[PDB]
Amino acid sequence: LKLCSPEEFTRLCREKTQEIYPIKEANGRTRKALIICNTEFKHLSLRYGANFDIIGMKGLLEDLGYDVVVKEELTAEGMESEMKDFAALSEHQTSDSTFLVLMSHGTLHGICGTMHSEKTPDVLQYDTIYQIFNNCHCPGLRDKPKVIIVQAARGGNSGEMWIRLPRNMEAD
Amino acid sequence: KLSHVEKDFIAFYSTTPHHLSYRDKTGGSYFITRLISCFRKHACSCHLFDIFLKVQQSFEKASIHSQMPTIDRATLTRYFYLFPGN
């Protein structure tokens, strides 16, 4: 990751003050980011290579100045409690933003927990994530960017067709 | 004090609704790999939306296992510059 020169940082803060989110100086700054990733499931296929997404995202967010919290192998209720725990961290008061990275198997309206199955649905609705982190329930991140990154399927259909799987490739 | 209920959110999904998302056993998720790559190249000079749009641009050409990352439920009111290194 190449850094932004201090002259550009002061240039954008002078030219477009009202148009950009205020960035706190790195002195008394405690940026927090959350990574939730599920690899092993009771009924679903093991997500091979999911560790290749954790460290890369964890290293990227660390290069961006975030302290990364990593929680793995969670049910839907486990994800919700870990998100509520992360949303109440006092470090958000001395932060300027947060990142939320969610990686697992997925459904149309939610992300799968470890216990998910056709007969045993274990799904955290993405709508619930917004409730946990909105201005009502997350006072530390009010007026601050909350970025949600989701790696998961959103259904079972293929995303391409013709108009007039490989061995090392898996589906989430 | 008065405030909105929901604001300053942005979501970046790996593909479109109803559709599968793919992952390489030897490299991880294609979406995560492209996202990290675009961030490393453009975070020093581009704000978050432009970075996301560059990720989406890299998926524009349809492939045999196509994905199209989508921006969702976005309530950013300003440009989010990360200013890496500051």
State the Cα–Cα distance between residues B86 and A23, nearest whole angstrom. 9
Q: Kindly tell me the sign of the dihedral angle through the C-alpha atoms of A81, A170, B9, A26.
A: positive
User: In angstroms, what separates the C-alpha of A24 from chain B's closest C-alpha?
Assistant: 9
Q: After which residues is chain A broken (C to N over 2.5 A)?
A: 164
Nearest CA to A171 out of B5, B36, B66 is that of B66
Query: Which technique was used to obtain these atomic coordinates?
Result: X-ray
A42 in Cβ contact with B83 (< 8 Å): no
User: In angstroms, what separates the C-alpha of B52 from chain A's closest C-alpha?
Assistant: 11
Place of tokens 């991140």: A141
Chain B nearest-CA residue for A12: B81
Q: What structural domains does chain A harbor? A: 6-151 (3.40.50.1460)
3-state secondary structure of A53: helix
- Header resolution in angstroms: 2.1
Candidates 3.40.950.10, 3.40.1350.10, 3.10.129.10, 3.30.70.1470; CATH matching B1-86: 3.30.70.1470
The total of other beta-carbon atoms located within 10 Å of residue B5's CB is 10
Q: What is the DSSP string of B6-59?
A: S-SEEEEESS-TTB--EEETTTEEHHHHHHHHHHHHHTTT--HHHHHHHHHHHT
Instruction: Compute φ and ψ for A10, nearest 5 degrees.
Output: -75, -25
Residue A116: alpha-carbon gap to chain centroid? 20
**B5 Cβ contact list (under 8 Å, min separation 6):** A134, A135, A136
State the Cα–Cα distance between residues A149 and B63, nearest whole angstrom. 23
CA angle B50, A23, A79 (to 5 degrees): 75
- Within 9-68 of B, beta carbons closer than 8 Å to A belong to 9-29, 31-33, 35-36, 39-41, 43-45, 47-48, 62-68
User: Where do the domains of chain B lie?
Assistant: 1-86
**Could you tell me if A50 lies within 8 Å of chain B, comparing CB atoms?**
yes
Nearest CA to A152 out of B67, B54, B55, B49 is that of B67
